[PDB]
Amino acid sequence: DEPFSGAKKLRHLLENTDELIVCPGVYDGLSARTAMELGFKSLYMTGAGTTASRLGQPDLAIAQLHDMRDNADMIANLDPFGPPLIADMDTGYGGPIMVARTVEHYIRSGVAGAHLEDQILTKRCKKVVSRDEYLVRIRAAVATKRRLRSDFVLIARTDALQSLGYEECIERLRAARDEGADVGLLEGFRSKEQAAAAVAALAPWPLLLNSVENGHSPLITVEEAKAMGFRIMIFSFATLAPAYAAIRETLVRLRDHGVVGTPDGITPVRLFEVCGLQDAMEVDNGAGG
Amino acid sequence: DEPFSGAKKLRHLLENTDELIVCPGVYDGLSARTAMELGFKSLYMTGAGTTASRLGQPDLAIAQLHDMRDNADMIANLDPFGPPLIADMDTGYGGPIMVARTVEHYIRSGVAGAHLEDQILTKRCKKVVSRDEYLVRIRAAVATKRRLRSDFVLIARTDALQSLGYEECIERLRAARDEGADVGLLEGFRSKEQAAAAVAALAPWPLLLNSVENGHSPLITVEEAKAMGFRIMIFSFATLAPAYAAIRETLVRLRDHGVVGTPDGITPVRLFEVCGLQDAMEVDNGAGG
Amino acid sequence: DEPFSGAKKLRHLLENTDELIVCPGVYDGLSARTAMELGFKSLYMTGAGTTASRLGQPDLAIAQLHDMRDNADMIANLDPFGPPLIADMDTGYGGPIMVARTVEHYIRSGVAGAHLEDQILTKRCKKVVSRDEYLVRIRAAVATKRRLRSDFVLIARTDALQSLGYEECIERLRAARDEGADVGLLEGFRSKEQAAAAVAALAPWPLLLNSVENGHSPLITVEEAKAMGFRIMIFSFATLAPAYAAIRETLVRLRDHGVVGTPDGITPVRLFEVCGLQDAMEVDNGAGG
Amino acid sequence: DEPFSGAKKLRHLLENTDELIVCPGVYDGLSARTAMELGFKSLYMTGAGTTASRLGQPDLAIAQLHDMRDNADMIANLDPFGPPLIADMDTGYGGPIMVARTVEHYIRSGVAGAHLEDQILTKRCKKVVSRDEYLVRIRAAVATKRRLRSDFVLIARTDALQSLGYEECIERLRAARDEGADVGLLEGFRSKEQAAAAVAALAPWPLLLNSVENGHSPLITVEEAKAMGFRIMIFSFATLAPAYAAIRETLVRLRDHGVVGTPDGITPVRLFEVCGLQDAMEVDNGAGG
Numbered sequence A, B, C, D: 001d002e003p004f005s006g007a008k009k010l011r012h013l014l015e016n017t018d019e020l021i022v023c024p025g026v027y028d029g030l031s032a033r034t035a036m037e038l039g040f041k042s043l044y045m046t047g048a049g050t051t052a053s054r055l056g057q058p059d060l061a062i063a064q065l066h067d068m069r070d071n072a073d074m075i076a077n078l079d080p081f082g083p084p085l086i087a088d089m090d091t092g093y094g095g096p097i098m099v100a101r102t103v104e105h106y107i108r109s110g111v112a113g114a115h116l117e118d119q120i121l122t123k124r125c126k127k128v129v130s131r132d133e134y135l136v137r138i139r140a141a142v143a144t145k146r147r148l149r150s151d152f153v154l155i156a157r158t159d160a161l162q163s164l165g166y167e168e169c170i171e172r173l174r175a176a177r178d179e180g181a182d183v184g185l186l187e188g189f190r191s192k193e194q195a196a197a198a199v200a201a202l203a204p205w206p207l208l209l210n211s212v213e214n215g216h217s218p219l220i221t222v223e224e225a226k227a228m229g230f231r232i233m234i235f236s237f238a239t240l241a242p243a244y245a246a247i248r249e250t251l252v253r254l255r256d257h258g259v260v261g262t263p264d265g266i267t268p269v270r271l272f273e274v275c276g277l278q279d280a281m282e283v284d285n286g287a288g289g
Ligand SMILES: O=C([O-])C(=O)[O-]
Pocket: A025, A045, A046, A047, A048, A049, A059, A088, A210, A236, A237
């Protein structure tokens, strides 16, 4: 109904429906505009993608609050009445003060939700901090969203599986739940059985499945994830990866054959249309221009 | 030889060789990193692409100095010893004071060159200002690059063909040349004959051909452009367009079939490798980490 | 009551009270934090000050949307429950598309209101555009705040007095009023009589008096302005000017006598306290840190 | 001689003279422009000041690379031929990858030098990391400035005195020296005797004295510091503190008496003059405007 109400919209989807919320991972204006064009009900802003696109760098804690907030603020608000945005917030970019600032900035920027992880600050796409230090992050985040009277959906992410194992992950999610996290994310399942098991272990508290295209986790389909009981599923590299493959293929053709060769329906005007040309023309015409 | 010497490198290519300098149009870190991966000798930063990707908006004078400089600064310097970057600088983002500031900022940011046009400030991918007002822009730009003792390659772009015709375009380029522009860009040729004619009219002053993929200008190949006498050729939508087509195709598959389906060789690690993973690991390992 | 409700708060002050709303002109975090420390009920973000502080440049259309929005976003939200912020929005930074984007960004950023002027885009602290072109700006701005269902207070500023005279100013304000502006600002009165006259001419539509410290307009006190019927009074250079005088005096002492000599009660900790140390410590302590 | 050669200029002052290099601490465009107006030969950009002014926050690791680089880039380049800028770089904003990125960005931005400290990432205006972890930072920084063939002056700062004592500080500086730091900074001396002692302990390797106005370190005059053997002296709060006192005094007067009362010589035009009005007018006039 109201503009900039992504958090309320996501919260409604989570609490008022049983649907699996499918969130394509977007990383810039073009990828986000394309997801919106196609009618996705929620979007996900990847940190890895944001770093690659906005900074041309690997996902090694190089993007910080300013870059992440700027990208999320841009994407969340392309349409003030558009789909909610879940955004990576990494480790919160510092201690509790920075976690709170991050949540506050995301909330202000119309971001619907974000995932906060237990990696050491010098993180990567892997060591984690203590359970207690993780919970300091979660507490700082929850207190902020409450202080701000926001419906912001905080997703507690654990990267502990690799180094600490399943039980530890489940216990961290349970602890995070108690501190006020709204959704859990056990990063990098090793098997589909294990994914269903984590859902069962934490039910009825909602989980989010992070599908990493061409990564090191099992390929789980949307229908498989829904049947498993997941409530959100994000697709981290859903746009960055095909963008790279296409850009590379095209530039190789340009290099070797002196032509770009992009299907002719992809015109500048169509691109502008995807990126809000109509809205802009309406503004201009409406203003008496 | 030296880091951040893109301007010198481009200048050398222009003055010390007869090669057609082929510049794929890039718009973010991923597109730029891909062009670099493939060994292009010079890159072009599109304004339309920058606006679509960094802002999710159409090319309607929405991106301003800060966005354009930030993107160019990022791209030009991904490799301090990398290929020169020619960047769109639109109309200079204001009067002479802003044109000068823009050139100064681009120069400081390691940008090798930029094209400056005669469109009215409220520009678009079309009305132009008077010849005199255009020359005020060119003069402000040239004086700046000279004041800064820079090899910065200033490209004088004219969008006058549409509304004023060929002769007017040629005269504006001649005037711009005299004010100190290094290269001319007659935007949007209507025919290959006309493109060769503009080159002949301004010889031996170098021209740059702007190829717009799927646009409204004749399809000219690299070999055709070289034979015509052009010295630079940029490919405005060379990466933005195929990126869109691929992202869209992928998201449609995700929407309809619940899987992303990106060829499996495009892994997160490969993407990180393209985006400077090795450099980063070298830094960390080298620092005793 | 609610966080980020500056627009509602300003609107309430305007519509629900007869008080003269006194807004000290602030330009950075320190000046804003000081105004807040002292209990001002509303703040004003100067464009000239923003340009001097964030960019080190004169008020010559050098700061653009990104700089202005970033500064306003920072200041408005230092306290989510703090005083409303009226921010300079100059000419809207472009055509109607940019005016709308500017208003949209200010609204999103919690800004309570802004003044929009009729200067030519290449403005200064003086030529104005036609009445019709001005109204295109106003219309774009009003349509945006309505589209966004916002209480944003749009102040229509006219700089026409200098070149066009009083009657023209009054007519522009009347026109702006009809297009939906909430408050009028006749910039640079020449006399106190003329200021009272403009109020009378537009009553009961509220006016805002812009007091420029050490400028070329009559010195009007708060009590004088209230008696004249003004509803808002901003103090453009209220913090930038004394900051400069003090910084200069201090640096001269440092240069000549080798000591800074700042009264000893102005400690780093006091400065941190003014700039939100307590809030930060509360966050950290509260998070279990 | 050449534009953007702050690093070379600072390096020359350090290596080719025996003068104490006096650097007033500046934090925005106005403070920097004032220091330049008065002829200081080098400027210092305070992190605390940058955080207070650009962010309105306390010096608690809230400003990150983007804010710090943006401020330093702005200040260093107000005059391409102006005085060198030494800028706070805190802990490097992350692990070795971020330290290197920070140094690279500062170098690109014309920054002459920077101090890098051994505080834990969650720093403050106090715990320090291990000697080895500190040296990882220093190594990353030195390798970067070398890779970039830059004269950048790296200042190794130690905050270890408080928790670890004098000997530890001296040993860290010696280690940092060996890893390639150009200057040492023992933060927060407890006595003048101890300051002279640190200089003697590290001679002939240059030290920098950080004078914190109204802080918890002894008041040392410029002449005292020179006699002690220091080669650089920075004045952290030299402009932020008097700015606050003046802004506060003024706003209190405005609040209580309805007038600003700033000495009348501090006009908008004078402020614009201090902030580069002449340069701007020269650009405009020169461009044929
Ligand atoms: O950055 C990402 O794409 C993530 O964390 O899933």
